[PDB]
Structure formats: structure tokens, C-alpha cells
Design a binder for this molecule. Structure first.
Ligand SMILES: *[C@@H]1O[C@H](CO)[C@@H](O[C@@H]2O[C@H](CO)[C@@H](O[C@@H]3O[C@H](CO[C@H]4O[C@H](CO[C@H]5O[C@H](CO)[C@@H](O)[C@H](O)[C@@H]5O[C@H]5O[C@H](CO)[C@@H](O)[C@H](O)[C@@H]5O)[C@@H](O)[C@H](O[C@H]5O[C@H](CO)[C@@H](O)[C@H](O)[C@@H]5O[C@H]5O[C@H](CO)[C@@H](O)[C@H](O)[C@@H]5O)[C@@H]4O)[C@@H](O)[C@H](O[C@H]4O[C@H](CO)[C@@H](O)[C@H](O)[C@@H]4O[C@H]4O[C@H](CO)[C@@H](O)[C@H](O)[C@@H]4O[C@H]4O[C@H](CO)[C@@H](O)[C@H](O)[C@@H]4O)[C@@H]3O)[C@H](O)[C@H]2NC(C)=O)[C@H](O)[C@H]1NC(C)=O
Ligand SMILES: *[C@@H]1O[C@H](CO)[C@@H](O[C@@H]2O[C@H](CO)[C@@H](O[C@@H]3O[C@H](CO)[C@@H](O)[C@H](O[C@H]4O[C@H](CO)[C@@H](O)[C@H](O)[C@@H]4O)[C@@H]3O)[C@H](O)[C@H]2NC(C)=O)[C@H](O)[C@H]1NC(C)=O
Ligand SMILES: CCO/N=C/c1ccc(OCC[C@@H](C)CCN2CCN(c3ccnc(N)c3)C2=O)cc1
Ligand SMILES: CCO/N=C/c1ccc(OCC[C@@H](C)CCN2CCN(c3ccnc(N)c3)C2=O)cc1
Lengths: 52, 245, 290, 58, 242, 49, 242, 49, 99, 58, 48
């Protein structure tokens, strides 16, 4: 619960996939544009594996 | 003498030769704040050319299964030009708007839009679906900016009010057999005579296709909708450093 | 002190005519005339059509004496509607110690809220009336103190608090044997109109998900807190309810807007049920029948 | 009639027939107000007002 | 003191009386008003604004509620077919509950005056046709063919450069005001029926869509009055509003 | 304590004691208790004819 | 007798009504008044008297409560350092609770008008310097360097024979009156920030004290009005006052 | 307030008094009358038939 | 150091506009700041106890016993006023009794 | 209006708009009083009044 | 959306077939000479 693990950001690569199949396209493309995100994030072990 | 028009203000003009007519919202033009109404005691700035221009913002493609879009004003122009620079430096703000939305099509396409204004267009959510969780809309659904935002449930306008009586508020139709543009001149409507330009969005421009687009296959399938707007009689006050949000 | 000609050169379309009754219908006859057509309008202008009765059908002289006084805003809104209910039970969870702070938001009941949400900006005086009784309905010899806590005044935290001394707040001492206490309330907002709809945020800064609770919350509308306690150091021996009715007078309303058709779910937001979007009217099986 | 101008309906030329007993005008009666209406700012708020008889798109 | 006798009606709370009540705040001068645009003086401004009448009140599911606002026309292969029909009274549950004429009339017990219905044809440019929009006065039932709805008040509507026409439902009544027509003995106050008939056809060239949509707008005339204000028929609340 | 209210033709009839139609947002209503004198209100000529 | 109907509001005790009540003493003529000096006709005499604003509201112990009335300047070795900053609203809990502008405003819900802050330099004679006193309007956050607080309303203050200067916080608002700014959605009514920056330095000769103190005085202008009187936020009582 | 003494006859309901009572409907203008034939002004028309 | 409040106005510090100030100064007069009935005394007449057990109580009129009315009227040194006292009496549980 | 001059506000030229029912003036309404204010006896009570524009210590 | 900021004309295709963009005289100088590449690009007029 302290150990920080830096890797890809799987939810923001999930919702890019949803824009490719037109599952909520203009909703998600408004999210990542106005709220700029990170492809690489850093959370703890218990967050990245048991819900965050 | 009504189908053909020209709207020149600032350094930018737009010509239209298949217009309907210009409607002036609530029967009065935008004007400056009189000294009966003003409460701020510093002298306002009035740029008078550099911000009273037709800003062409974005281009929404309209296909046969669209829902509708909305733009919150003036947060479509707090990122653009000398309006977006004066509204970020100055705390107070008032202006009217001349709102011109173009949508051309051939003489074989069909379909109608309801481009309408409505002041204080607050946005509700679906309340968690079943209607028991107090969900508030995010900041991007609230104030989408120049990108616009697409309506989820246009029958209730995402606010629990029906679109069937949106026609009370200042509006006009773009049906593609008669016109191709819709000018709506809107004064400054708000209680207090100036307000902040970053927090309060005075009105929202609902553009909803009610009668859907239809055309036989072979015609041009890309029918864009571009909105251009011009802040008229704009003035700012309360100078400080730049806030962006 | 200028030689330039640019600086030295640097209004409503409609007139309110008096209309006490609906307008008369003058006599028309037939017309067989080209060129001018009163039926064919252009609805894409966005104007309501100015076609009258006389230019569509042969009409008679009808002197219309039907008054238009019932439909003014002072006759449509000056009806006392239930806007608040305050419970003071003997034992329970919700206010068990004989005081209740009800902050004045009159959007909690859907008949008064439905009418005043027709307009965006409303400026009005109101006279509130506080009909109080036991939950079974009967009146009991119990003394109450109502007091009005403006924004900034100390909220009373208990029945035997110090804020009930009402040195400057207005307060009403009525017992339940009396008729309902009725006081009139001015237009108190800092802005020039109570706006029922505030599309915006009150405070600056970044707007994250944790502070989307401020969306639609304008400080010009929240006008304080209405507090009520049973006057006494001991606990009162009667369960109580206090129903608050207000009628609006001297009303000015601006900028109409569409009237709600989905059910209300919360106060101070237009949230509606998502799976249960019901149509605004009734329905029929086919269009060519009734 | 030596009351203060406290009512939320000040802003017209004519007054109303409201009987009042206190020194504050907002405590007065609602009274009867003027039967002036202006439907042309909601019905046809166009810039150049066209008539009924003419075709609207000449 | 002065002799005073307390007659009945004492100590009640009528919710519609117009009485002087005590001010909570001595000599409080409120915030002075600003010229805010669009001031309503009377609710008969709002009954005269045209507003989308939903004639096609058939579909009910949430994914097709926008289908209600407009009803289709198409190229018929025949002679005088019925396009749409609706009740012409703003009080009855039906098409008129979407318009603001029909929901401000929900607050008033009885209305009077003629009222207008406007039909905007939203087809293509090169698609023409003629429709017969016939108002049948009360008593006369739903007409069975075009040659009996012809007898009532009717409008021959041509599709042209001026896209819309206004059927003006006149004020034909046995009574000065009429209340809201419902099923029963309150059907005495019915206003009639409005039925829309193809008069010639809907002809198109090749390349035009052979199905066009008509948007029905509806408002009232300037002799429209209402009286005897009441509460509306729908209650927009089920539980405690949290 | 009693509440009288007048339901015109078309207004929602209240179906129970704790109903929603007793909010009387536009209907006229009289709140009188039985210790008071009898509630007396005047009624105009309301008929359409 | 005369017919009289008792409408609601009967038999209550409103604590703000202005009513005739029975005299306890018939024809009692009180003591005739003397010309006593300093008669107050209005509380806006007292909001226009300059009064010590405690910008240095940091120290709290009882042996150093006099440290609050004045804040230090000293010879900085650099470029444009922040001397002091305070909220510019008389309602918020902070510096303004010591001034009588900020405690008569505690009795009124909402105030308006421009208001002045006066800074008296209490250094030695031969110690000079220039301070920048900048009022930042609302929305603009706490400035990070002197070249962003420069953008707002500001005063360049020179230390001279006239010892004090008056920053005049102007009335910049979106609303006619504003209520008391607290944390939450009531922060909508914030007035801004006043930040004090060294513009050049504080230079002294040898023999002068290199640390001087500025006393901040504060009052309101002549367009200052208040309304909607209420009770104050502090209650000056804990137990029974014996 | 103003001194007022409540003399007897207070709080009764005489069924023949001709008193002002509160209107349920503010500014309601009723339906204007038609010339309907045979208007009775007095019951001594009917005693002479 | 003169001891005068400063007579510097808005116009001679910043470029200002013509503002017709119609904000009334009537709420801040002394007759609108003080004419609110505040609690200045409480008298207990209990059945059995120590403090007044026999159904009488002498409360000498000193209105400086409660700190909301006392706080306002201690702003001024000399005050000359008429007053209307009101005596709201009840049982300690709050109810009214025929006494 | 044949009352005694018993009120504790006697000592000005103008009277006030106070309605009274008894014969004693102290039993009257508080009424509305004159909106005259004199801030210069608390703000700048100096002997020789200096103006705004001049430096105060010439 | 950046060429929108300059002087511009919205041109509709209609029965009147042509429109006239009027390039206004915006200069720092009364006359301007011929703009070529180099220090004579000081006299450029702009872009359409
Ligand atoms: C692992 O695994 C996984 C699983 O699988 C995977 O995933 C994947 O991924 C992929 C990639 O991304 C994908 O794919 C893709 O997809 C996409 C999508 O699709 C979808 O969607 C759609 C949409 O729709 C829309 O629109 C329409 C019109 O168009 C309409 O109608 C509708 O209604 C809709 O609307 C909506 O939306 C919109 C949007 O905008 C809005 O606005 C509105 O409002 C509304 O809401 C759909 O449609 C589809 O559908 C489908 O399916 C169904 C079933 O149910 C059917 O029925 C239908 O019909 C369809 O089918 C069809 O189609 C398709 C297409 O779409 C096809 O494919 C098929 O086959 C058939 O045919 C869906 O759902 C799409 O888009 C794409 O496509 C593209 O690509 C391709 C290749 O890649 C090609 O081939 C094509 O062609 C296309 O292309 C195009 O596009 C592009 C982009 O956009 C462009 O650029 C180009 O140019 C083009 O265009 C052209 O062409 C066209 C024709 O097409 C024309 O028109 C134009 O003009 C031009 O010329 C793709 O495919 C998938 O999906 C996924 N999956 C799933 C299952 O899904 C992954 O990947 C893996 N991994 C690895 C590594 O690999
Ligand atoms: C995976 O890789 C990433 C980067 O490649 C790595 O993330 C970094 O880890 C370091 C070490 O844990 C973090 O640095 C700490 O940050 C905190 C927060 O400010 C500081 O308080 C810490 O200061 C301490 O530094 C010394 C100990 O390292 C002590 O001597 C000193 O006194 C302080 O106590 C420390 O700087 C850094 O923040 C992250 N970076 C990010 C972006 O998360 C991560 O640790 C790697 N994971 C594993 C499992 O190896
Ligand atoms: C003894 C003393 O007795 N005192 C009684 C008493 C009575 C009433 C009172 O103040 C009444 C305030 C109402 C008139 C207006 C309420 N308003 C304005 C708009 N608004 C809004 C706007 C937008 N969203 C929401 N949610 C709500 C809202 O709720 C003060 C004191
Ligand atoms: C049936 C008969 O009903 N009679 C009622 C009735 C009511 C009131 C009453 O007299 C009221 C007196 C008050 C108006 C002023 C009280 N005052 C003056 C200043 N003072 C001070 C000054 C300095 N230190 C202290 N501690 C106190 C103070 O306490 C007489 C009779």
C-alpha cells in the first residue's frame, strides 16, 4: 500500500478503444481533450490491482 | 429582400443569399450598461472592433441519426482571440451576441433543425439511471467550450424540460428546402448588470435536428453545421492577472 | 482635444399596448384575390404567425368583452402554496430535541416549484404563513418561536441556545391556539431577481468531481435559515409539525422557459430519472384514429 | 400615505390600488395591476416586421 | 374601547386572500431593478407563441421519443388518404399537452377564443403536393372520407416557397367559455377534430426522398382568454424530493 | 385542524389524506380549526354559461 | 357593534413590528434634553472613521496581542518581496474583525460601496522606501510575484513627510450589494486580495533602526451602504451573566 | 394597536346577516350576461298571474 | 497622525464611471438598528425550589443581563429612548396554562 | 391630533410620521426619521479643515 | 479557426454568383513598395 508502480494507464487505453468502435465516441473524446490525461501513471500496488 | 442579407460587424462580414430573416431576441438590441444600472465604479474597457467579430468556431457533421448539440455562451469564446484575452484578464463582463449558424444542402436533401437560444440553460443528469443517486454533471458537460457537446436525451434537453416547447425562447428553423442559415441577435440577459465570464454562462445555443436529414444515396453525405457568433456591445471591467478557468 | 472623426460618432422594437379584453372580431367577407396570401406563413422565420380569423373565414362582428385580468402574474402567483414542512417530534432521529433549522429553499414541493420554474428570473415580495399543529392534526397549548437567520447570523444549535435571544433577528412568538402566524417578506436578494436557474459555478478555481456540488448553486438565491423551537428549557410534551405556505405579491417575472415534464428528484438541480423518461403527454395506438 | 418605497414592483409610471397599513410598501396588498401586454416581443421578434397580408419571403 | 363584533370567517387562513401582513424588516429598501430583457406582463404573451404540437403521439419508448414531434407524408398511390387526425381541444389529454398553450391552459379551468395550428413542411425543395387540413366542428364525428371532411372549415395547403400554412380553428361554441373536455358529461365542451387529408399526392423526382415530415406548430389567437385558475392535472412528484 | 379546498373541473382530486394535491399551489384552500368561528368565503358566478 | 373579521397573523408577537402599545404612565413629560456633544444620527458616521485594521493577525498569546496592530518592514536584500497580504472583505473572519467597519457590518447581511485602507508608516525620519499596495479583484488568485499583482489596481507609496497613503479598494462587483464572503458557495461574494510588495527597498543610514512598522487603518467611503440587519456572528456570553 | 372592544353577538353565524366575506378567487371576471327572456325582478310578478 | 479619517475619494485614485448611487441609507439609522425586541430579562416562578418558591419575583430593571441587547447598546455611551416591553410568559415546558 | 409632547425624540425642527392612538407621544410608532448624517464630526473634526487635493502638512 | 481571426468574408453560393473580398489598406506606411524576399519583405501585404 506504499509501493508505487509506474506503468501504462489501462482505463485511458480502454476508452480510446471504445471510441474506435463508436461506443460513446463524442462523450469520451470530450473527456481526454479538456481533461488532459497521462498515458503513464503511478499508483500503489493495492490500487492498481484491487480497484481505484 | 429578405432571402439575401449581409451582416458586417468588426472587420468580418458574412453574406447569405438564402436567409430566412433576422430575429432580435426579446425584441431589443444589445446595448451598453447605463449609469442607472451599473454598480462597479471603475471605468470599463470597450474594445469596439477587436472583439465584435464573427468568430467561426467549429463544424459538427450532421448525419441521419444525430441527436443535437449545445454551446454554452460565452464560454465558447474564452479561449479565442481578443475576446478570450479580455475575458480572462477582466473580472466583469457584459455583451450581446449575434449568432449565425450555417447549414447548406442541395435541393434534394431534406430535414429541419431547431436552432434555439435559452437563458440559464442548466444541465441535469440521468440521476444514476433509476433516479435515486444525486449525480452532478461534470465540468465538460457543463461548459464544453468551443468544441460543443452532444445531447444525450434531446426530448428532455438533458434538463427535464421538453423540446416541444423550446420554441418559446428565441429561435428559428433551418429547413433545407427554404433556408440555409439562421441569425439570432441576443441581448445581454442576466440579473446583475456585469458578471464573471469564466463562471456564469448566460445562455446555451441548442441546435437539434427535429425532422431528420434524408437524401437518396448518391448525393453528398457530409452536411456540416458551423456556428459563427459575434459579441456585440461588449465591455469588460475589473482588471487583474489572467485566470483560465 | 481630437481631430479624428472616428471617435465623435461612436432601444426596443416592441410597444406594450393596453389590452384589457381580448380583441374583437370585425366583419369579413369572401376574397378572391391573388398576390396577397394571409394563410401561407414562413415558420422558419421563428415568428408566431400573425394570421387572424377574418382572413381565413367569413366572420361576424363579435364584441369581445372577455377580461384578461385572471392571467396576469399577480393573479397567477398570489396563491399560498406549500413550500416547506418542519417536523419537531418527541423522540426520533430527525430533530429529537425540539428545534429545527430549515434553510429557505422553496423548491422542495412540486406544485409551487412547477409554476415558478416557468420563468427564469422572478422578483417578488412574499407573505409566509406558518400553520402548525400536532401530527394527528389537533391544536395543543404550546408556545413556539420562529426566527429568521440571514446568511452570516449564528445558527441556533440547540433549544436552549443563546441565538434565540433575537437581539436583531426578526422573530415570531405564536402559540398553537392562535391563528397561523403570517408575516410578509420583502425582496431580499443582492441581485435584481431571484434566478431559479444558475448555469454556472459560484466560486473560481478548478472544478473537479468532488466540488460539483456547487453547480447550479447561486448565492443570490439562498437567503438564509428559518429556525423554530418550542419555547422552554424542558422538552415539550407534544409532537409538532409546522407547514409553511407562501404566496407571492408584487411579482415581476422575466424570460419564460419550458415547463418541467419529468418528475422532480432533488432540490436545486434539474436531475431527472434516466431509464424512466416518460413522454410529456398521453399516447394512442395509431395516428389516423382517436 | 407616508410610506417608504420598499415594494418589489417599483419601476413603472402608474401606481397600483394597494391598501397598506404599515410604513413599508412590501407589506401592502397585491392589488390589481395594469392590463398592458406586449405579445410582439415573444410572438414575432423579427428585425423588419412583415405584415399579415404579404408573403413572408418575398 | 371601540365596539367591534367579530363576524364569521374569523381566524381562518384562506390561501387566496389578498391581505396586509406584518413586515419582518422595518424600512428595508430592496435592490433596485435592472432592465432585464423579456419581461412578461401577462400569461397571454405565452399562449400566443407557436410551439410544437405533437400530432404523432404514438411512439412511447425512450429511444424514439423524438419521433413524436413530426408526422410523415409519403407518395400515396391513390385518392385522398387520411394523413393524421387529432382532437382540437387544448384541455384533453393528447397532442396538446406538449404545447405551452396546452400547459398554461392546464392551470385555468375554462378557456375561450380561436386558436391556430401551423404546419411546417420539412421535405425537400423539389417535392410538391397539396394537403387538405379540415377542422370539423363538434358533434360531427371522425370523417370517413375526404368528401365529408370537406364540408367543415378547411384549408387547401400548397407546398411552396412559403413552407408553412396556418389552419385557424375558429371559436365555434354554444357557450362563452368552455372548460376542459374529458370523457363523460364533460365531453359537452369538446372543440372538434382536425383531420389532414392528401388532396392530390406527394410527388417527387428521382433522387428525392419519397417520405417527408410535417412539423405541427400550435398557439392561440389574440382573442384567447382564460379564467378561474386551478392546479394542473399532472403532479410532478412521487416521493419526498430529497 | 381542517383543510377545505376547492377542486375545479380538471384539477386533480385528492385520493387520500396524505396526498400531494393538498399542497394547494393554485387551488383556493381554507385552514380553519374547530375552535374558530365557521369559515365563511364568498364564491362568484363561475359557470361558463 | 361594528363588523370586524380577524385575519391571520392575529395574536402573534413579531419582534420587529412597529406598533402602538399602551402607555404605563398617563401624561408623563420626560426630562428635557441637553446639547450633549457628538450625536449619532446614522451608523454610517461610524463606518467612515478610520480604525486600526490588524493585518498581522498571526500572534495569539496574551503577552503579545499588541503585536497584531502593526506589521513589520525591514531592509530586504533583493527584488520585490511580499510584505503582507490580507483578504479585502469586511465580512470574512480575519483582519477586518478589529475595525468598526468590520463589526458594524457584522450586524448587516449585505453591504456595498468602495472602502479605503490607510497605511501609516511609523519608521524613523531618515528611513525611506517605496511600497506597492495592490488590490487584486476577485477571481485572480494570490499573486506569486510583484509583476502579476502589478496588473490589478495598485498604489505606489512613497515614504515622505506625509506619512500615510490610502489604498482605495474600489467597488468592483457583479452585483449591487454583496453579502458576507465565507468558505463555500458564499465565496461567490469575495471582494479580492490586498497584497503589499516592496517596490525598491527600505534604506536606512547607520544609526537608524533597520526594522520599521506599518499601522494599517481602514474605513469606508461615502458611497458605503448596508441593509437587511441581522444579529452578529460572535455571541459574547458563555454562561449566565451573574 | 387600535383599541377595540368585542361586544356580544361575536363569533356567531346568523343565517340572514348581510356581510362581506372573503373572495376565494382574486380578480375573477365572470361570464357576461345575455338578454335571456322573462326576467323576474320581484316575486309579485308571480302572485299576479 | 492628524487624527482625521482620510477624505480621499474614488475618483482621484482610479478612472471611474458615472454611477448614480440609489442605495438607500435608511436601514442604518438608529431607529432601524435598535427597534428590535431583544431578550433583556427572564423571571422564574417555580413550584418548589430555592429561587422564588412562593410565587413572586422581584426583578430589578437592568437590561444588561443578556449579551445580544447589551452588546449593541454598549456601542454608544449615552442613549435616550422610549421602549415597549413585552412579557411572554409560559410553563417551562413551553405550554400555556390558564393562570 | 391633540397629544402631549412626551416623546423622547423632541428636539428637532421636523416631526416624524408616527401614528398614535393614545394621548401620550411616547406610546407612538417609531416611524421613519430624517436621513441627515454628519460624518465630518467623527471623520475629520479638525480645526482648520484641509482639502483632499492638497498635501495635509504644508 | 485561426484564419477566422483576420479580416474575412463568409461567401454563400447563390443566384448572385460572385463575392468580393476587399483587402483593406492596412499598413504601417503611406505607400509600400514591391515585396520581395529579403529586407523588402517589410512591405508584404498579407495572405489570402
Ligand atoms: C481484438 O479484438 C477486438 C474485438 O473484435 C477488436 O476490436 C475491433 O476493433 C476494430 C478496429 O477499430 C473495429 O473495427 C472497426 O469498427 C468501426 C466501427 O463499426 C461499428 O460502428 C458503426 C458506427 O455506426 C454509426 O454510423 C453509421 C453511419 O456510418 C450510422 O448508421 C449508425 O447509426 C452509427 O451512428 C451512431 O454513431 C455516430 C458516430 O459518429 C453518432 O454520430 C450517431 O449519433 C449514432 O449514435 C456501426 O454502424 C457498425 O455496425 C456494424 O455492425 C452491425 C452489426 O450489428 C451491422 O448491422 C452494421 O451494418 C455494421 O456492419 C458493417 O459496417 C462495418 C463498418 O462500420 C463493417 O466492418 C462490417 O463488415 C459491415 O460492413 C459497428 O458497430 C468501423 O467504422 C471500422 O470500419 C472501417 O475500417 C475497416 C477496416 O479497418 C474498413 O473496411 C471500413 O470500410 C471502415 O473504413 C471507413 O472508416 C474509416 C474510419 O472511420 C475511414 O477513415 C475510411 O475512410 C472508411 O470510410 C470510407 O468507407 C465508408 C464505407 O464503410 C464510406 O461510408 C465513407 O464515406 C468512406 O468512403 C472498423 O471495421 C471493430 O468494431 C472492433 N470489434 C468489434 C467487434 O467491434 C480489436 O481490434 C482486436 N485487437 C487487435 C489488435 O486487432
Ligand atoms: C518504479 O519507478 C518509479 C520511477 O522510475 C519509482 O517512483 C519514484 O520512487 C521514489 C522512491 O520511492 C519516489 O521518491 C520519494 O517521493 C516522496 C514524495 O515526495 C519523498 O518524500 C521521498 O523522499 C525521501 O527520499 C529518501 C528515500 O528515497 C529519504 O532519504 C528522504 O529523507 C525522503 O524520506 C522520495 O523522494 C518518487 O516520488 C517516485 N516517483 C513517482 C513518479 O512516483 C517507484 O518507486 C518504482 N517502484 C518500485 C517498486 O521500485
Ligand atoms: C419571524 C421571522 O419570519 N421570517 C419569515 C421568513 C420567510 C421567508 C424568508 O425568505 C423567503 C425567501 C423566499 C421568498 C425566496 C426563496 N428562494 C429565492 C429563489 N430560490 C431558489 C432559487 C434557485 N434554487 C433554489 N433551490 C431556490 C429560493 O428558494 C425569510 C424569513
Ligand atoms: C405594569 C407595568 O409595566 N411596566 C413595565 C416596565 C418596563 C420597563 C421599565 O423601565 C424600563 C427601563 C429601561 C427602558 C432602561 C433600563 N436601563 C437604563 C440604563 N440601564 C443601565 C445603565 C447602566 N448600567 C446598567 N446595568 C443598566 C438600564 O438597565 C419600567 C416598567
Amino acid at each position: 500500500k506504499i509501493d508505487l508502480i509506474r506503468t501504462l494507464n489501462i482505463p485511458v487505453l480502454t476508452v480510446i478503444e471504445w471510441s474506435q468502435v463508436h461506443f460513446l465516441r463524442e462523450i469520451i473524446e470530450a473527456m481526454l481533450k479538456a481533461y488532459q490525461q497521462k498515458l503513464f501513471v503511478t499508483h500503489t500496488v493495492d490500487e492498481l490491482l484491487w480497484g481505484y | 429582400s429578405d432571402r439575401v442579407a449581409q451582416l458586417t460587424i468588426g472587420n468580418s462580414t458574412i453574406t447569405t443569399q438564402e436567409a430566412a430573416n433576422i430575429i432580435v431576441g426579446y425584441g431589443e438590441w444589445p446595448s451598453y450598461c447605463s449609469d442607472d444600472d451599473a454598480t462597479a465604479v471603475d471605468k470599463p474597457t470597450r474594445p469596439d472592433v477587436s472583439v465584435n467579430r464573427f468568430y467561426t468556431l467549429d463544424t459538427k457533421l450532421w448525419e441521419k441519426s444525430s441527436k443535437g448539440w449545445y454551446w454554452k455562451f460565452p464560454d465558447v469564446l474564452t479561449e479565442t482571440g481578443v475576446f478570450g484575452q479580455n475575458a480572462q484578464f477582466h473580472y466583469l463582463y457584459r455583451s450581446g451576441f449575434c449568432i449565425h449558424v450555417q447549414c447548406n444542402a442541395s435541393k434534394f436533401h431534406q430535414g429541419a433543425l431547431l436552432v434555439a437560444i435559452l437563458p440559464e440553460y442548466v444541465i441535469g443528469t440521468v440521476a444514476g439511471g433509476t433516479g435515486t443517486e444525486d449525480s452532478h454533471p461534470p465540468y465538460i458537460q457543463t461548459q464544453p467550450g468551443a468544441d460543443g457537446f452532444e445531447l444525450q436525451h434531446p426530448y428532455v434537453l438533458d434538463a427535464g424540460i421538453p423540446i416541444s416547447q423550446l420554441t418559446v425562447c428565441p429561435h428559428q428553423w433551418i429547413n433545407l428546402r427554404t433556408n440555409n442559415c439562421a441569425t439570432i441577435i441576443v441581448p445581454y440577459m442576466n440579473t446583475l448588470p456585469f458578471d464573471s465570464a469564466l463562471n456564469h454562462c448566460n445562455f446555451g445555443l441548442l441546435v437539434v435536428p427535429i425532422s431528420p436529414l434524408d437524401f437518396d444515396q448518391g448525393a453528398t453525405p457530409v452536411i456540416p453545421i458551423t456556428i459563427t457568433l459575434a459579441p456585440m456591445c461588449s465591455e469588460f471591467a475589473g482588471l487583474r492577472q489572467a485566470v483560465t478557468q | 482635444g481630437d481631430r479624428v472623426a472616428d471617435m465623435i460618432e461612436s432601444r426596443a422594437l416592441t410597444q406594450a399596448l393596453p389590452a384589457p379584453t381580448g380583441q374583437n372580431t370585425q366583419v369579413s367577407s369572401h376574397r378572391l384575390d391573388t398576390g396577397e396570401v394571409p394563410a401561407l406563413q414562413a415558420a422558419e422565420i421563428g415568428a408566431s404567425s400573425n394570421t387572424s380569423d377574418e382572413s381565413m373565414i367569413e366572420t361576424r362582428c363579435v364584441l369581445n368583452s372577455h377580461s384578461t385580468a385572471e392571467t396576469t402574474l399577480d393573479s397567477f402567483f398570489s396563491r399560498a402554496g406549500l413550500v416547506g414542512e418542519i417536523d419537531l417530534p418527541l423522540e426520533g432521529t430527525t430533530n429529537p430535541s425540539g428545534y429545527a433549522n430549515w434553510d429557505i429553499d422553496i423548491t422542495g414541493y412540486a406544485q409551487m416549484r412547477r409554476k415558478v420554474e416557468l420563468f427564469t428570473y422572478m422578483r417578488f415580495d412574499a407573505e409566509f404563513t406558518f400553520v402548525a399543529c400536532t401530527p394527528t392534526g389537533q391544536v395543543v397549548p404550546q408556545l413556539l418561536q420562529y426566527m429568521f437567520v440571514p446568511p452570516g447570523a449564528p445558527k441556533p444549535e440547540s433549544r436552549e441556545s443563546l441565538a434565540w435571544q433575537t437581539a436583531t433577528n426578526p422573530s415570531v412568538f405564536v402559540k398553537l391556539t392562535d391563528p397561523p402566524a403570517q408575516v410578509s417578506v420583502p425582496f431580499m436578494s443582492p441581485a435584481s431577481a431571484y434566478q431559479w436557474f444558475y448555469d454556472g459555478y459560484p466560486t473560481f478555481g478548478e472544478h473537479k468531481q468532488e466540488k460539483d456540488l456547487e453547480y447550479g448553486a447561486c448565492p443570490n438565491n439562498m437567503m438564509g435559515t428559518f429556525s423554530v423551537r418550542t419555547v422552554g428549557s424542558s422538552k415539550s410534551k407534544y409532537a409538532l409539525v409546522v407547514r409553511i405556505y407562501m404566496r407571492m405579491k408584487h411579482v415581476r417575472a422575466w424570460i419564460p422557459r419550458p415547463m418541467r415534464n419529468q418528475n422532480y428528484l432533488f432540490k436545486a438541480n434539474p436531475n431527472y430519472a434516466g431509464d424512466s423518461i416518460k413522454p410529456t403527454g398521453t399516447s394512442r395506438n395509431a395516428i389516423t384514429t382517436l | 400615505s407616508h410610506e417608504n418605497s420598499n415594494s418589489a414592483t417599483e419601476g413603472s409610471t402608474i401606481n397600483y390600488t394597494t391598501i397598506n397599513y404599515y410604513k413599508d410598501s412590501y407589506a401592502a396588498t397585491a392589488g390589481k395591476q395594469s392590463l398592458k401586454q406586449d405579445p410582439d416581443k415573444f410572438a414575432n421578434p423579427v428585425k423588419d416586421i412583415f405584415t399579415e397580408m404579404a408573403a413572408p419571403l418575398k | 374601547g371601540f365596539p367591534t363584533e367579530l363576524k364569521p370567517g374569523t381566524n381562518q387562513f384562506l390561501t387566496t386572500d389578498d391581505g396586509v401582513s406584518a413586515p419582518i424588516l422595518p424600512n428595508f429598501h430592496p435592490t433596485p431593478c435592472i432592465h432585464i430583457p423579456g419581461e412578461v406582463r401577462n400569461l397571454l404573451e405565452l399562449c400566443q407563441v407557436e410551439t410544437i404540437l405533437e400530432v404523432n403521439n404514438v411512439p412511447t419508448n425512450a429511444t424514439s421519443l423524438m419521433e413524436r414531434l413530426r408526422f410523415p407524408v409519403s407518395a400515396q398511390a391513390g385518392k385522398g388518404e387520411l394523413c393524421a387526425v387529432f382532437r382540437a381541444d387544448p384541455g384533453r389529454d393528447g397532442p396538446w399537452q406538449s404545447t405551452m398553450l396546452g400547459q398554461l391552459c392546464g392551470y385555468y379551468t375554462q378557456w375561450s377564443g380561436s386558436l391556430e395550428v401551423t404546419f411546417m413542411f420539412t421535405g425537400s425543395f423539389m417535392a410538391t403536393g397539396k394537403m387538405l387540413i379540415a377542422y370539423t366542428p363538434p358533434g360531427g364525428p371522425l370523417p370517413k372520407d375526404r368528401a365529408t371532411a370537406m364540408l367543415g372549415t378547411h384549408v387547401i395547403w400548397d407546398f411552396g416557397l412559403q413552407s408553412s400554412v396556418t389552419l385557424v380553428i375558429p371559436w365555434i361554441s354554444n357557450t362563452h367559455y368552455r372548460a376542459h373536455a374529458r370523457d363523460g358529461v364533460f365531453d359537452y365542451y369538446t372543440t372538434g377534430l382536425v383531420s389532414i387529408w392528401y388532396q392530390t399526392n406527394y410527388v417527387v423526382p428521382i433522387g428525392a426522398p419519397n417520405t417527408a415530415y410535417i412539423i405541427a406548430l400550435a398557439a392561440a389567437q389574440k382573442n384567447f382568454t382564460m379564467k378561474l385558475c386551478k392546479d394542473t392535472s399532472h403532479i410532478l412528484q412521487t416521493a419526498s424530493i430529497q
